Design a protein around this nucleic acid. Structure first.
Length: 200
DNA sequence: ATGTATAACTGCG
DNA sequence: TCGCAGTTATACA
């Protein structure tokens, strides 16, 4: 059971394949059944002064009593469901890391995507990581650095059943997108777990 | 108060 | 197809 450690100036990440085809497939199907995404008005964001709707499908889940601002739109996460607990318990029992909140993204195909984002936030616990889990289609994850100087970009194929671990830094211009890959045709579900403040 | 960042898009090469 | 340039009008640090 092996890990890859990702390092560049300001960057610390740890990719691994947590799940074999045995359960990752079983879980993927159980996710498609049960996960309820946001629709219409709740699936919208304000970026650069306009409202758009997300080129994907989103959901939030978590412990009771929390709120999460996502790009100028604040909701309360839906209570946990048996499959999300089932996963979280596995991640936690392996990473020794607890989480109260997860943000779920379904991408129907290679043009369903997400845009460059800094985790720069004070909504996360003081020193705590972010666990990114993926199921379905293998898709590229991208890290870009803000600058002024020329240091490279970190591309990463996130496979069916794989865990990516990222540390939250308090001072980093590392942005993360998951760009369009037109050639991809299968669906992809992606759950990033977080530890949220309860102050909200 | 005055600076600065933005989870999205289109139109180029 | 893919990546990079340029947003845009409030929001908030």
């Amino acid at each position: 059971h092996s890990w890859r450690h990702i390092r560049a100036e300001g960057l610390d990440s740890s990719y691994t394949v947590l799940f074999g085809k045995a359960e990752a497939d079983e879980i993927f199907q159980e996710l498609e059944k049960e996960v309820e995404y946001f629709t219409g008005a709740l699936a919208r964001v304000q970026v650069f002064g306009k409202w758009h709707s997300v080129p994907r499908k989103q959901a939030t889940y978590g412990d009771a009593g929390l709120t999460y601002t996502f790009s100028g739109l604040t909701l309360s996460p839906k209570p946990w469901i048996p499959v999300l607990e089932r996963i979280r318990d596995h991640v936690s029992g392996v990473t020794g890391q607890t989480f109260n909140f997860v943000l779920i993204n379904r991408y129907k195909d290679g043009s369903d995507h997400i845009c460059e984002h800094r985790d720069d936030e004070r909504e996360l616990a003081p020193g705590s990581p972010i666990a990114s889990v993926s199921f379905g289609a293998s898709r590229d994850f991208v890290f870009r650095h803000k600058d002024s100087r020329r240091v490279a970009v970190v591309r990463l194929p996130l496979a069916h059943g794989s865990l990516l671990m990222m540390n939250h830094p308090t001072n980093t211009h590392w942005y993360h997108s998951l760009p369009v890959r037109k050639k991809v045709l299968a669906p992809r579900v992606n759950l990033t777990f977080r530890k949220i403040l309860l102050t909200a």
